[PDB]
Design a protein around this ligand. Structure first.
Ligand code: MG
Lengths: 180, 7
């Protein structure tokens, strides 16, 4: 059994992109944040705590365009009790065709690894967007690096990455660009 | 610690 079902007919010819959440699209902490974008109550050991969520700049332009260009998949090492509410609020266009959480990761030498071989997709047509190069140790030639984001509101990386994803969305084999 | 490298 693979992590993903068969791609829907409107996704089948597109490239798959697995997209990280924390420090890629949003940043959260339990330390109170003024003027947060979302606050999500998250139960931990039977006590609800408020998780304060900041949206990385340009993330709506990014998700909205990505969902057109790709079969986008949320793939995070966090628990669904936190990720699903965040994703529900972020994904205003249905970009994420599937959601994969910590239980879908592989623990490898102290690190949760997104083993792309388990998605059920030709790896010539799979990309991973993740701020943590450890997340894609088994598939470095599938990766589009992105710097970890916390609160810098001057950041523009999601904006700056789009014309490159525009190119990638049209190739037959991502390795022809990323070299493998 | 929301998405942690390690538990
Ligand atoms: Mg991350």
């Amino acid at each position: 059994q693979y992590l993903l079902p068969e791609a829907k007919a409107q996704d089948s010819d597109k490239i798959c992109v697995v997209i990280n959440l924390d420090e890629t699209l949003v940043h959260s902490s339990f330390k109170p944040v003024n003027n947060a974008d979302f606050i999500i109550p998250v139960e931990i050991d039977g006590v609800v705590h408020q998780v304060y969520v900041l949206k990385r700049p340009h993330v709506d332009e990014f998700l909205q365009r990505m969902g057109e260009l790709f079969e986008c998949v949320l793939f995070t090492a966090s628990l669904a009790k936190y990720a699903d509410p965040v994703a529900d609020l972020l994904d205003k266009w249905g970009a994420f065709r599937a959601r994969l959480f910590r239980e879908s990761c592989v623990f490898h030498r102290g690190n949760y690894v997104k083993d792309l071989s388990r998605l059920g997709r030709d790896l010539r047509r799979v990309l991973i967007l993740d701020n943590s190069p450890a997340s894609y140790v088994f598939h470095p030639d599938n990766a589009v690096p992105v710097a970890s984001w916390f609160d810098n509101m001057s950041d523009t990386e999601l904006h700056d990455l789009l014309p490159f994803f525009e190119q990638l969305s049209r190739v037959d084999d991502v390795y022809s660009v990323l070299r493998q | 610690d929301l998405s942690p490298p390690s538990p």
